């Protein structure tokens, strides 16, 4: 359960799990997450910006 450095995960096919729903950005108590998104070249819902300010983060 230990909370360490943040990471972004993939599906077993290598596809990004992130779907740019921006729930983490909304819930983030320190406003440490910055997200921008657009439809990918194949029409998928993916992020173009996903930043975590680790000096704003409270882990």
């Amino acid at each position: 359960r230990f909370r360490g450095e943040h990471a972004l995960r993939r599906y077993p096919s290598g596809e990004e799990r992130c779907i740019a729903c921006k729930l983490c950005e909304a819930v983030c108590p320190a406003q440490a997450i910055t997200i921008e998104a657009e439809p990918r070249a194949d029409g998928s819902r993916r992020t173009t910006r996903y930043d975590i300010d680790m000096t704003k983060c409270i882990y």
Binding site: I19, C21, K22, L23, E25, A37, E38, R45
Partner: protein, 230 residues
């Protein structure tokens, strides 16, 4: 005058003849839950979310279509109305797809908000869900018809406001579908308003897709300059 007297939770209300239960309720500052009712479209009465109990009446009535009678006491927060709302929301959510994270309507969805306010908090649906194929109606309105709740707001807007009779329903029962039945584009100077009137993410803006969420946008009230209408 010609006004009649009705009660909303025991409070006297003076309304014109032909006023519906929903309008009488909104005169005292309560908004009846609704999906299919739009005050600028014709009355449909299909979604059944607006069912409300009238005192001394065994059966609940549809507040959007029922004119209120003199002396009626509308009980908007009784057990009957709440259980009717919960049942209707259950039936609405039985086949709805788990698409909220990928739906653009998320955060400004009437289905979500009215589920949070008037529905239950869990599911007892143990079957498989239905899935329908998408319709291409142009490069402006994105179409994901699995999220459709069959309100028919879009059909009524196309018929009455835009003057275009290209939208309708095909099939019946659980298989009823909203579309054109043929590959056809709903291209009109007012075609983009079906995105707004649609309560759910079945119809969404294609240029706006995936870019933002409603809670992070800042609202600036301004005036359009693309014509002389203002």
């Amino acid at each position: 005058s010609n006004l009649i007297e009705v009660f909303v939770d025991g409070q006297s209300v003076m309304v014109e003849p032909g006023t519906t239960v929903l309008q009488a309720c909104e005169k005292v500052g309560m908004q009846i839950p609704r999906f299919c009712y739009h005050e600028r479209l014709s009355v449909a009465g299909n979604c059944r979310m607006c069912l409300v109990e009238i005192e001394k009446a065994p059966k609940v009535v549809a507040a959007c279509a029922m004119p209120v009678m003199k002396g009626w006491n509308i009980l908007t927060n009784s057990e009957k109305s709440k259980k009717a709302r919960e049942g209707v929301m259950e039936f609405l959510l039985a086949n709805h797809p788990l698409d909220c994270p990928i739906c653009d309507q998320g955060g400004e969805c009437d289905l979500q908000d009215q589920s949070m306010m008037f529905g239950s908090d869990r599911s007892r649906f143990l079957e498989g869900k239905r899935a329908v194929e998408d319709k291409n109606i142009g490069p402006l309105v994105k179409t994901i018809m699995t999220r459709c709740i069959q309100c028919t707001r879009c059909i009524r807007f196309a018929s009455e406001i835009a003057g275009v009779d290209d939208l309708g329903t095909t099939g019946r029962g659980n298989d009823m579908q909203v579309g054109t039945y043929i590959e056809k584009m709903f291209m009109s100077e007012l075609s983009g308003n079906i995105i707004d009137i649609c309560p759910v993410g079945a119809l969404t803006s294609k240029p706006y897709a995936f870019t933002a969420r409603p809670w992070e946008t800042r609202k600036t009230e301004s005036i359009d300059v693309m014509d002389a209408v203002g």
